[PDB]
Design a protein around this ligand. Sequence first.
Ligand SMILES: [Mg+2]
Ligand SMILES: [Mg+2]
Ligand SMILES: [Mg+2]
Ligand SMILES: [Mg+2]
Ligand SMILES: [Mg+2]
Ligand SMILES: [Mg+2]
Ligand SMILES: [Mg+2]
Ligand SMILES: [Mg+2]
Ligand SMILES: [Mg+2]
Ligand SMILES: [Mg+2]
Ligand SMILES: [Mg+2]
Ligand SMILES: [Mg+2]
Ligand SMILES: [Mg+2]
Ligand SMILES: [Mg+2]
Ligand SMILES: [Mg+2]
Ligand SMILES: [Mg+2]
Ligand SMILES: [Mg+2]
Ligand SMILES: [Mg+2]
Ligand SMILES: [Mg+2]
Ligand SMILES: [Mg+2]
Ligand SMILES: [Mg+2]
Ligand SMILES: [Mg+2]
Ligand SMILES: [Mg+2]
Ligand SMILES: [Mg+2]
Ligand SMILES: [Mg+2]
Ligand SMILES: [Mg+2]
Ligand SMILES: [Mg+2]
Ligand SMILES: [Mg+2]
Ligand SMILES: [Mg+2]
Ligand SMILES: [Mg+2]
Ligand SMILES: [Mg+2]
Ligand SMILES: [Mg+2]
Ligand SMILES: [Mg+2]
Ligand SMILES: [Mg+2]
Ligand SMILES: [Mg+2]
Ligand SMILES: [Mg+2]
Ligand SMILES: [Mg+2]
Ligand SMILES: [Mg+2]
Ligand SMILES: [Mg+2]
Ligand SMILES: [Mg+2]
Ligand SMILES: [Mg+2]
Ligand SMILES: [Mg+2]
Ligand SMILES: [Mg+2]
Ligand SMILES: [Mg+2]
Ligand SMILES: [Mg+2]
Ligand SMILES: [Mg+2]
Ligand SMILES: [Mg+2]
Ligand SMILES: [Mg+2]
Ligand SMILES: [Mg+2]
Ligand SMILES: [Mg+2]
Ligand SMILES: [Mg+2]
Ligand SMILES: [Mg+2]
Ligand SMILES: [Mg+2]
Ligand SMILES: [Mg+2]
Ligand SMILES: [Mg+2]
Ligand SMILES: [Mg+2]
Ligand SMILES: [Mg+2]
Ligand SMILES: [Mg+2]
Ligand SMILES: [Mg+2]
Ligand SMILES: [Mg+2]
Ligand SMILES: [Mg+2]
Ligand SMILES: [Mg+2]
Ligand SMILES: [Mg+2]
Ligand SMILES: [Mg+2]
Ligand SMILES: [Mg+2]
Ligand SMILES: [Mg+2]
Ligand SMILES: [Mg+2]
Ligand SMILES: [Mg+2]
Ligand SMILES: [Mg+2]
Ligand SMILES: [Mg+2]
Ligand SMILES: [Mg+2]
Ligand SMILES: [Mg+2]
Ligand SMILES: [Mg+2]
Ligand SMILES: [Mg+2]
Ligand SMILES: [Mg+2]
Ligand SMILES: [Mg+2]
Ligand SMILES: [Mg+2]
Ligand SMILES: [Mg+2]
Ligand SMILES: [Mg+2]
Ligand SMILES: [Mg+2]
Ligand SMILES: [Mg+2]
Ligand SMILES: [Mg+2]
Ligand SMILES: [Mg+2]
Ligand SMILES: [Mg+2]
Ligand SMILES: [Mg+2]
Ligand SMILES: [Mg+2]
Ligand SMILES: [Mg+2]
Ligand SMILES: [Mg+2]
Ligand SMILES: [Mg+2]
Ligand SMILES: [Mg+2]
Ligand SMILES: [Mg+2]
Ligand SMILES: [Mg+2]
Ligand SMILES: [Mg+2]
Ligand SMILES: [Mg+2]
Ligand SMILES: [Mg+2]
Ligand SMILES: [Mg+2]
Ligand SMILES: [Mg+2]
Ligand SMILES: [Mg+2]
Ligand SMILES: [Mg+2]
Ligand SMILES: [Mg+2]
Ligand SMILES: [Mg+2]
Ligand SMILES: [Mg+2]
Ligand SMILES: [Mg+2]
Ligand SMILES: [Mg+2]
Ligand SMILES: [Mg+2]
Ligand SMILES: [Mg+2]
Ligand SMILES: [Mg+2]
Ligand SMILES: [Mg+2]
Ligand SMILES: [Mg+2]
Ligand SMILES: [Mg+2]
Ligand SMILES: [Mg+2]
Ligand SMILES: [Mg+2]
Ligand SMILES: [Mg+2]
Ligand SMILES: [Mg+2]
Ligand SMILES: [Mg+2]
Ligand SMILES: [Mg+2]
Ligand SMILES: [Mg+2]
Ligand SMILES: [Mg+2]
Ligand SMILES: [Mg+2]
Ligand SMILES: [Mg+2]
Ligand SMILES: [Mg+2]
Ligand SMILES: [Mg+2]
Ligand SMILES: [Mg+2]
Ligand SMILES: [Mg+2]
Ligand SMILES: [Mg+2]
Ligand SMILES: [Mg+2]
Ligand SMILES: [Mg+2]
Ligand SMILES: [Mg+2]
Ligand SMILES: [Mg+2]
Ligand SMILES: [Mg+2]
Ligand SMILES: [Mg+2]
Ligand SMILES: [Mg+2]
Ligand SMILES: [Mg+2]
Ligand SMILES: [Mg+2]
Ligand SMILES: [Mg+2]
Ligand SMILES: [Mg+2]
Ligand SMILES: [Mg+2]
Ligand SMILES: [Mg+2]
Ligand SMILES: [Mg+2]
Ligand SMILES: [Mg+2]
Ligand SMILES: [Mg+2]
Ligand SMILES: [Mg+2]
Ligand SMILES: [Mg+2]
Ligand SMILES: [Mg+2]
Ligand SMILES: [Mg+2]
Ligand SMILES: [Mg+2]
Ligand SMILES: [Mg+2]
Ligand SMILES: [Mg+2]
Ligand SMILES: [Mg+2]
Ligand SMILES: [Mg+2]
Ligand SMILES: [Mg+2]
Ligand SMILES: [Mg+2]
Ligand SMILES: [Mg+2]
Ligand SMILES: [Mg+2]
Ligand SMILES: [Mg+2]
Ligand SMILES: [Mg+2]
Ligand SMILES: [Mg+2]
Ligand SMILES: [Mg+2]
Ligand SMILES: [Mg+2]
Ligand SMILES: [Mg+2]
Ligand SMILES: [Mg+2]
Ligand SMILES: [Mg+2]
Ligand SMILES: [Mg+2]
Ligand SMILES: [Mg+2]
Ligand SMILES: [Mg+2]
Ligand SMILES: [Mg+2]
Ligand SMILES: [Mg+2]
Ligand SMILES: [Mg+2]
Ligand SMILES: [Mg+2]
Ligand SMILES: [Mg+2]
Ligand SMILES: [Mg+2]
Ligand SMILES: [Mg+2]
Ligand SMILES: [Mg+2]
Ligand SMILES: [Mg+2]
Ligand SMILES: [Mg+2]
Ligand SMILES: [Mg+2]
Ligand SMILES: [Mg+2]
Ligand SMILES: [Mg+2]
Ligand SMILES: [Mg+2]
Ligand SMILES: [Mg+2]
Ligand SMILES: [Mg+2]
Ligand SMILES: [Mg+2]
Ligand SMILES: [Mg+2]
Ligand SMILES: [Mg+2]
Ligand SMILES: [Mg+2]
Ligand SMILES: [Mg+2]
Ligand SMILES: [Mg+2]
Ligand SMILES: [Mg+2]
Ligand SMILES: [Mg+2]
Ligand SMILES: [Mg+2]
Ligand SMILES: [Mg+2]
Ligand SMILES: [Mg+2]
Ligand SMILES: [Mg+2]
Ligand SMILES: [Mg+2]
Ligand SMILES: [Mg+2]
Ligand SMILES: [Mg+2]
Ligand SMILES: [Mg+2]
Ligand SMILES: [Mg+2]
Ligand SMILES: [Zn+2]
Lengths: 107, 95, 97, 70
Amino acid sequence: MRVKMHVKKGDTVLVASGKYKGRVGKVKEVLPKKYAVIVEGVNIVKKAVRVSPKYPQGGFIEKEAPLHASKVRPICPACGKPTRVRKKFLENGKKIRVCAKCGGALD
Amino acid sequence: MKTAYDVILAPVLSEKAYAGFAEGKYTFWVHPKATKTEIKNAVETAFKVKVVKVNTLHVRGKKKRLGRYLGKRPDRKKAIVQVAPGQKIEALEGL
Amino acid sequence: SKVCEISGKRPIVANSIQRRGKAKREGGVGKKTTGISKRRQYPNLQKVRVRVAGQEITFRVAASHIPKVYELVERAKGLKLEGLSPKEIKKELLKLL
Amino acid sequence: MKLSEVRKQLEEARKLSPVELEKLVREKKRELMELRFQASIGQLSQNHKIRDLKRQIARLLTVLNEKRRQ
RNA sequence: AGCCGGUAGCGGGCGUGGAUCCCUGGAUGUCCGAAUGGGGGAACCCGGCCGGCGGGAACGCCGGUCACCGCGCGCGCGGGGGGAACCUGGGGAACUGAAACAUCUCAGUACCCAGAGGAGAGGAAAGAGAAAUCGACUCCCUGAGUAGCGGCGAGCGAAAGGGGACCAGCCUAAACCGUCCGGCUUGUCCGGGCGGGGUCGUGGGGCCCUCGGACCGAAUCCCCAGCCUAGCCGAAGCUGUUGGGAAGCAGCGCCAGAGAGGGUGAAAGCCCCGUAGGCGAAAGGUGGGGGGAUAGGUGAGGGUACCCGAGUACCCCGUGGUUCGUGGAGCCAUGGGGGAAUCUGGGCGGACCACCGCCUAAGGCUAAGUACUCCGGGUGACCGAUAGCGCACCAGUAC
RNA sequence: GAAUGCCGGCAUGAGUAACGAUAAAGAGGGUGAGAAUCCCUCUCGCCGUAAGCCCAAGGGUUCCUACGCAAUGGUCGUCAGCGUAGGGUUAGGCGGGACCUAAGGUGAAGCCGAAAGGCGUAGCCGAAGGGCAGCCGGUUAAUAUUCCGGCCCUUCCCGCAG
RNA sequence: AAUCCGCCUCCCAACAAGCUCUGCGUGGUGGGGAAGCCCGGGUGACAACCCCCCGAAGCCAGGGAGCCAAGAAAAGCCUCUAAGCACAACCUGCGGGAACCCGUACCGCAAACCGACACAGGUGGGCGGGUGCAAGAGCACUCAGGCGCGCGGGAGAA
Ligand SMILES: [Mg+2]
Ligand SMILES: [Mg+2]
Ligand SMILES: [Mg+2]
Ligand SMILES: [Mg+2]
Ligand SMILES: [Mg+2]
Ligand SMILES: [Mg+2]
Ligand SMILES: [Mg+2]
Ligand SMILES: [Mg+2]
Ligand SMILES: [Mg+2]
Ligand SMILES: [Mg+2]
Ligand SMILES: [Mg+2]
Ligand SMILES: [Mg+2]
Ligand SMILES: [Mg+2]
Ligand SMILES: [Mg+2]
Ligand SMILES: [Mg+2]
Ligand SMILES: [Mg+2]
Ligand SMILES: [Mg+2]
Ligand SMILES: [Mg+2]
Ligand SMILES: [Mg+2]
Ligand SMILES: [Mg+2]
Ligand SMILES: [Mg+2]
Ligand SMILES: [Mg+2]
Ligand SMILES: [Mg+2]
Ligand SMILES: [Mg+2]
Ligand SMILES: [Mg+2]
Ligand SMILES: [Mg+2]
Ligand SMILES: [Mg+2]
Ligand SMILES: [Mg+2]
Ligand SMILES: [Mg+2]
Ligand SMILES: [Mg+2]
Ligand SMILES: [Mg+2]
Ligand SMILES: [Mg+2]
Ligand SMILES: [Mg+2]
Ligand SMILES: [Mg+2]
Ligand SMILES: [Mg+2]
Ligand SMILES: [Mg+2]
Ligand SMILES: [Mg+2]
Ligand SMILES: [Mg+2]
Ligand SMILES: [Mg+2]
Ligand SMILES: [Mg+2]
Ligand SMILES: [Mg+2]
Ligand SMILES: [Mg+2]
Ligand SMILES: [Mg+2]
Ligand SMILES: [Mg+2]
Ligand SMILES: [Mg+2]
Ligand SMILES: [Mg+2]
Ligand SMILES: [Mg+2]
Ligand SMILES: [Mg+2]
Ligand SMILES: [Mg+2]
Ligand SMILES: [Mg+2]
Ligand SMILES: [Mg+2]
Ligand SMILES: [Mg+2]
Ligand SMILES: [Mg+2]
Ligand SMILES: [Mg+2]
Ligand SMILES: [Mg+2]
Ligand SMILES: [Mg+2]
Ligand SMILES: [Mg+2]
Ligand SMILES: [Mg+2]
Ligand SMILES: [Mg+2]
Ligand SMILES: [Mg+2]
Ligand SMILES: [Mg+2]
Ligand SMILES: [Mg+2]
Ligand SMILES: [Mg+2]
Ligand SMILES: [Mg+2]
Ligand SMILES: [Mg+2]
Ligand SMILES: [Mg+2]
Ligand SMILES: [Mg+2]
Ligand SMILES: [Mg+2]
Ligand SMILES: [Mg+2]
Ligand SMILES: [Mg+2]
Ligand SMILES: [Mg+2]
Ligand SMILES: [Mg+2]
Ligand SMILES: [Mg+2]
Ligand SMILES: [Mg+2]
Ligand SMILES: [Mg+2]
Ligand SMILES: [Mg+2]
Ligand SMILES: [Mg+2]
Ligand SMILES: [Mg+2]
Ligand SMILES: [Mg+2]
Ligand SMILES: [Mg+2]
Ligand SMILES: [Mg+2]
Ligand SMILES: [Mg+2]
Ligand SMILES: [Mg+2]
Ligand SMILES: [Mg+2]
Ligand SMILES: [Mg+2]
Ligand SMILES: [Mg+2]
Ligand SMILES: [Mg+2]
Ligand SMILES: [Mg+2]
Ligand SMILES: [Mg+2]
Ligand SMILES: [Mg+2]
Ligand SMILES: [Mg+2]
Ligand SMILES: [Mg+2]
Ligand SMILES: [Mg+2]
Ligand SMILES: [Mg+2]
Ligand SMILES: [Mg+2]
Ligand SMILES: [Mg+2]
Ligand SMILES: [Mg+2]
Ligand SMILES: [Mg+2]
Ligand SMILES: [Mg+2]
Ligand SMILES: [Mg+2]
Ligand SMILES: [Mg+2]
Ligand SMILES: [Mg+2]
Ligand SMILES: [Mg+2]
Ligand SMILES: [Mg+2]
Ligand SMILES: [Mg+2]
Ligand SMILES: [Mg+2]
Ligand SMILES: [Mg+2]
Ligand SMILES: [Mg+2]
Ligand SMILES: [Mg+2]
Ligand SMILES: [Mg+2]
Ligand SMILES: [Mg+2]
Ligand SMILES: [Mg+2]
Ligand SMILES: [Mg+2]
Ligand SMILES: [Mg+2]
Ligand SMILES: [Mg+2]
Ligand SMILES: [Mg+2]
Ligand SMILES: [Mg+2]
Ligand SMILES: [Mg+2]
Ligand SMILES: [Mg+2]
Ligand SMILES: [Mg+2]
Ligand SMILES: [Mg+2]
Ligand SMILES: [Mg+2]
Ligand SMILES: [Mg+2]
Ligand SMILES: [Mg+2]
Ligand SMILES: [Mg+2]
Ligand SMILES: [Mg+2]
Ligand SMILES: [Mg+2]
Ligand SMILES: [Mg+2]
Ligand SMILES: [Mg+2]
Ligand SMILES: [Mg+2]
Ligand SMILES: [Mg+2]
Ligand SMILES: [Mg+2]
Ligand SMILES: [Mg+2]
Ligand SMILES: [Mg+2]
Ligand SMILES: [Mg+2]
Ligand SMILES: [Mg+2]
Ligand SMILES: [Mg+2]
Ligand SMILES: [Mg+2]
Ligand SMILES: [Mg+2]
Ligand SMILES: [Mg+2]
Ligand SMILES: [Mg+2]
Ligand SMILES: [Mg+2]
Ligand SMILES: [Mg+2]
Ligand SMILES: [Mg+2]
Ligand SMILES: [Mg+2]
Ligand SMILES: [Mg+2]
Ligand SMILES: [Mg+2]
Ligand SMILES: [Mg+2]
Ligand SMILES: [Mg+2]
Ligand SMILES: [Mg+2]
Ligand SMILES: [Mg+2]
Ligand SMILES: [Mg+2]
Ligand SMILES: [Mg+2]
Ligand SMILES: [Mg+2]
Ligand SMILES: [Mg+2]
Ligand SMILES: [Mg+2]
Ligand SMILES: [Mg+2]
Ligand SMILES: [Mg+2]
Ligand SMILES: [Mg+2]
Ligand SMILES: [Mg+2]
Ligand SMILES: [Mg+2]
Ligand SMILES: [Mg+2]
Ligand SMILES: [Mg+2]
Ligand SMILES: [Mg+2]
Ligand SMILES: [Mg+2]
Ligand SMILES: [Mg+2]
Ligand SMILES: [Mg+2]
Ligand SMILES: [Mg+2]
Ligand SMILES: [Mg+2]
Ligand SMILES: [Mg+2]
Ligand SMILES: [Mg+2]
Ligand SMILES: [Mg+2]
Ligand SMILES: [Mg+2]
Ligand SMILES: [Mg+2]
Ligand SMILES: [Mg+2]
Ligand SMILES: [Mg+2]
Ligand SMILES: [Mg+2]
Ligand SMILES: [Mg+2]
Ligand SMILES: [Mg+2]
Ligand SMILES: [Mg+2]
Ligand SMILES: [Mg+2]
Ligand SMILES: [Mg+2]
Ligand SMILES: [Mg+2]
Ligand SMILES: [Mg+2]
Ligand SMILES: [Mg+2]
Ligand SMILES: [Mg+2]
Ligand SMILES: [Mg+2]
Ligand SMILES: [Mg+2]
Ligand SMILES: [Mg+2]
Ligand SMILES: [Mg+2]
Ligand SMILES: [Mg+2]
Ligand SMILES: [Mg+2]
Ligand SMILES: [Mg+2]
Ligand SMILES: [Mg+2]
Ligand SMILES: [Mg+2]
Ligand SMILES: [Mg+2]
Ligand SMILES: [Mg+2]
Ligand SMILES: [Mg+2]
Ligand SMILES: [Zn+2]
């Protein structure tokens, strides 16, 4: 019905696996069809660009490479620890993500 | 619901269509099912003119391809209205 | 050939069996079948014309149910039948079955 | 068109009468033709306007139908 | 919490004032197609009537309406066409087997046709068949390759009974009573509609005397539980190291009603999706379960001898069905001829007769247990791109 | 490991036969990375009851223009009926329909047939037959009895007059 | 039903006419218009546009004769009357308005159709110029127009 994403633009995530394991960053973008997130300054790649109006002088640019969403963990804004996410029902009763270490909202 | 704006789709843009403005002949793409009589009325209520003569012709879609995939463009009909001596359709005088 | 409008009797298919030889009961060796082929047995259909309500109604009916046509005519008296078409009379008549 | 503009359109339309609804579709069907003509000579950068108008008309006729249905 | 399908790009937009998306309902839905105004070489053409638009009478467009058949007093209702298998009914081969072939077989199969429906058929004894018995029908096991049938060749092949699945029984016709309508050969008439009555095999019912004067309950209807059509919550891991990458190795932990499985840069219970265990419907659908209502249901002697399904039974001729191929050939069915009776009537128990029994024909309906798999899901000592569907791919396509 | 097996791939024959009418070519100039093969000119040859022109079938964009040459072209290719794109088909009078009937088809009535279905006066359908009003010229890259010009004409509606 | 058509009789007309329809000529007017020469276009040009001959298988046409094998229908159209209606309606003349749908490109004896091919095959109708040869749609050459057939270059055996 919808892909399940445990993370979103632009909560702050720990990158827990791959070359960039350990890095922290904002999620610039979420790409659910590809099940992937773009994290700021994580997974940089050198792309060639043709000499073009958009890029005269040509050469290369840096781009952020998407990460498989499972590599990423939201950092709790209360305790500052990376966490699994839980759902808690409020009184509304809207539902929200809360850190699984303490109980803090993650938004 | 059916309005004149349903019958006249777009103006025909080409050397040949433009060549007609001089003698008062405006050429539109119209809906493929629309009658000379109905086009006369539609053009009259849309561009506030007096339509005096209507020429229509069918235009078959060109067969066209994209890689493996053969297809056809939509079939169209074009109409050529003659407005009364002296009138003009300014939207088309354009150019 | 066809269907009795009264009894419903239709053409049926029957075998025609050809036999040879002397029956056992007559001291023969027994009967041998020398052919079986399908054939049809038709109802004995005939036309019965009847006047009912000053109209001429006609039935295609197996001879066995020829009397059932006239019996229908009798039951017809209790009916408001005049002015009707002969298609219409026959329908009413038939409905009485 | 913005979601709130859409509600707004519906509320307003629903207040209208059939005749007023008809008048307004005709006006919009007219406004679409202009858009078309502009789109065809390459002078409509704001092309989302076409999908928009088309749905407005749909919403309107939809509502016209509502009224006349009972 | 992203989004404007596959689908990126140009060019523009939308979304926590809740978008995209998912489910339900609704609206719109050109033309063709049963196709149904009429025509026609399907997807085009041409009309009638009413209303509307345009300056509108000619012309054109928009809305509505107009086929035929059946049933019921022009109007109502219904039909028509499709559906992969399954089902019934009406028709119905041949190769082949018989080591040739005709009867026989293949086979009442293949196939054509009609019809249904989520099933269909059958079904409440004129049964079975030997028991002083059983008790509708259907379906499975068995009985049994028995009994039998059979150029007594090749081959074909029951049923009762027993064990199971499911379980349910009803409505009429007639006698007689009432009512409306119609007929001409005037009523104690005949006939047709409708209502009442009645429904059975210890025979039952009708009518006439006598006596007696609440319970059951649907297969119809109503409500509801439950189910389907979207979903949702869901425990526990960090560090070091090799490495492009850890989930490998190492250290120290932890969860478990969850160590099914799939992903994640390699090999992860604890990262992700899940899993166990739970939760969830405003709307539509279902609802065989629960509840309620309604229709409907129910006596005993005695007398009378009115009724108890007709071109029927019955007999003969021609055939089919059955295991039964003419056989000692009954039974069930019926194309032809003849042709009854109403319980002191009738059919049956394998020619026939007697005796002794069984059963009540010629009107109708009836859940469930059964068949199938287009569709959804689960699961494989199933395939893994020459396999597996013809098709993993834009295939019933190219050709 | 064999089934003139099946499917696929790749060899051999072989740089071989052939390159599809023996109407026939030559040169100069241009273009281009490239030219016997494309454009232009001159010369030569062939058809001319056709090998020219116009209609109908069938075909379905193949037409015209621009940009192209991987493949398609029996060679080459700068060219093309090829690739990409853009343009192009204009009718009261031509053809067909809103007219008629032909064979035949279909078919109220009606007849027949196990089912499916088969017939069938009327009627309806059915044409390259009947009926019916447009000629000459100009114009486009590409349409013209269609546009334009000139001169003519048909039917329908309404009205006026007789 | 009919005043029409058919049939009978009479009168006038008759290889006439008249009336009517068509072909052709003319006809207000509108158009075209060569070679050659300059770069499809300009010019030639105020182009000229006249006379004679030949002459159809085409037209007048529904013409004529002969023959035997004896040669569509229906509508349009004219006429007759019926229900009707006769302020209607129909005819004639004039005037104003109205006049829909589909086709139309291109190939079309062929490299675009039928032949798996840009295939020496097959494909209905019309036009098909000039000269000479008795004639002709034959034959030769040739106009308009269109082509040299989508491998070539050499060599000069069997
Ligand atoms: Mg969720
Ligand atoms: Mg680290
Ligand atoms: Mg909510
Ligand atoms: Mg609409
Ligand atoms: Mg031009
Ligand atoms: Mg057209
Ligand atoms: Mg046209
Ligand atoms: Mg398309
Ligand atoms: Mg016989
Ligand atoms: Mg015997
Ligand atoms: Mg003996
Ligand atoms: Mg025998
Ligand atoms: Mg008789
Ligand atoms: Mg009989
Ligand atoms: Mg008899
Ligand atoms: Mg919306
Ligand atoms: Mg898109
Ligand atoms: Mg953009
Ligand atoms: Mg964008
Ligand atoms: Mg909500
Ligand atoms: Mg929906
Ligand atoms: Mg439309
Ligand atoms: Mg339709
Ligand atoms: Mg139709
Ligand atoms: Mg029809
Ligand atoms: Mg009207
Ligand atoms: Mg007007
Ligand atoms: Mg009007
Ligand atoms: Mg209109
Ligand atoms: Mg209409
Ligand atoms: Mg209509
Ligand atoms: Mg049917
Ligand atoms: Mg059906
Ligand atoms: Mg059968
Ligand atoms: Mg039948
Ligand atoms: Mg049979
Ligand atoms: Mg059968
Ligand atoms: Mg046969
Ligand atoms: Mg045989
Ligand atoms: Mg066999
Ligand atoms: Mg055998
Ligand atoms: Mg044999
Ligand atoms: Mg044999
Ligand atoms: Mg033999
Ligand atoms: Mg045999
Ligand atoms: Mg066999
Ligand atoms: Mg058999
Ligand atoms: Mg089968
Ligand atoms: Mg059916
Ligand atoms: Mg079932
Ligand atoms: Mg059932
Ligand atoms: Mg049933
Ligand atoms: Mg019973
Ligand atoms: Mg045994
Ligand atoms: Mg034996
Ligand atoms: Mg058998
Ligand atoms: Mg038996
Ligand atoms: Mg049993
Ligand atoms: Mg049992
Ligand atoms: Mg069971
Ligand atoms: Mg009676
Ligand atoms: Mg009575
Ligand atoms: Mg009565
Ligand atoms: Mg009794
Ligand atoms: Mg019941
Ligand atoms: Mg979860
Ligand atoms: Mg979890
Ligand atoms: Mg490292
Ligand atoms: Mg690690
Ligand atoms: Mg470890
Ligand atoms: Mg488990
Ligand atoms: Mg596992
Ligand atoms: Mg796993
Ligand atoms: Mg890797
Ligand atoms: Mg492991
Ligand atoms: Mg493993
Ligand atoms: Mg795992
Ligand atoms: Mg569960
Ligand atoms: Mg669960
Ligand atoms: Mg009693
Ligand atoms: Mg009695
Ligand atoms: Mg009985
Ligand atoms: Mg009876
Ligand atoms: Mg018999
Ligand atoms: Mg038999
Ligand atoms: Mg015997
Ligand atoms: Mg027997
Ligand atoms: Mg009989
Ligand atoms: Mg008895
Ligand atoms: Mg007796
Ligand atoms: Mg009997
Ligand atoms: Mg008997
Ligand atoms: Mg007996
Ligand atoms: Mg018995
Ligand atoms: Mg019995
Ligand atoms: Mg039944
Ligand atoms: Mg039940
Ligand atoms: Mg059942
Ligand atoms: Mg099943
Ligand atoms: Mg499945
Ligand atoms: Mg595997
Ligand atoms: Mg493969
Ligand atoms: Mg395969
Ligand atoms: Mg492979
Ligand atoms: Mg498949
Ligand atoms: Mg394949
Ligand atoms: Mg494909
Ligand atoms: Mg071997
Ligand atoms: Mg070989
Ligand atoms: Mg070989
Ligand atoms: Mg092989
Ligand atoms: Mg092999
Ligand atoms: Mg092979
Ligand atoms: Mg091979
Ligand atoms: Mg080789
Ligand atoms: Mg060599
Ligand atoms: Mg050799
Ligand atoms: Mg050689
Ligand atoms: Mg060779
Ligand atoms: Mg060759
Ligand atoms: Mg050679
Ligand atoms: Mg050649
Ligand atoms: Mg050659
Ligand atoms: Mg030669
Ligand atoms: Mg040169
Ligand atoms: Mg070249
Ligand atoms: Mg070259
Ligand atoms: Mg050269
Ligand atoms: Mg050459
Ligand atoms: Mg050249
Ligand atoms: Mg020659
Ligand atoms: Mg010549
Ligand atoms: Mg073709
Ligand atoms: Mg093409
Ligand atoms: Mg062209
Ligand atoms: Mg082209
Ligand atoms: Mg070309
Ligand atoms: Mg070029
Ligand atoms: Mg090429
Ligand atoms: Mg090349
Ligand atoms: Mg090349
Ligand atoms: Mg390319
Ligand atoms: Mg090639
Ligand atoms: Mg080449
Ligand atoms: Mg070739
Ligand atoms: Mg070039
Ligand atoms: Mg080419
Ligand atoms: Mg091209
Ligand atoms: Mg014209
Ligand atoms: Mg014409
Ligand atoms: Mg009309
Ligand atoms: Mg017609
Ligand atoms: Mg006709
Ligand atoms: Mg027929
Ligand atoms: Mg006929
Ligand atoms: Mg007609
Ligand atoms: Mg015609
Ligand atoms: Mg004609
Ligand atoms: Mg015409
Ligand atoms: Mg003319
Ligand atoms: Mg041309
Ligand atoms: Mg053009
Ligand atoms: Mg003109
Ligand atoms: Mg007057
Ligand atoms: Mg008369
Ligand atoms: Mg007189
Ligand atoms: Mg003249
Ligand atoms: Mg004249
Ligand atoms: Mg000139
Ligand atoms: Mg010149
Ligand atoms: Mg001059
Ligand atoms: Mg001068
Ligand atoms: Mg003559
Ligand atoms: Mg005729
Ligand atoms: Mg007629
Ligand atoms: Mg009168
Ligand atoms: Mg006039
Ligand atoms: Mg029309
Ligand atoms: Mg054209
Ligand atoms: Mg042309
Ligand atoms: Mg050509
Ligand atoms: Mg040509
Ligand atoms: Mg030829
Ligand atoms: Mg020809
Ligand atoms: Mg040619
Ligand atoms: Mg060809
Ligand atoms: Mg070809
Ligand atoms: Mg060639
Ligand atoms: Mg050829
Ligand atoms: Mg020929
Ligand atoms: Mg001569
Ligand atoms: Mg000569
Ligand atoms: Mg000669
Ligand atoms: Mg000559
Ligand atoms: Mg010649
Ligand atoms: Mg020349
Ligand atoms: Mg050559
Ligand atoms: Mg040599
Ligand atoms: Zn926390």
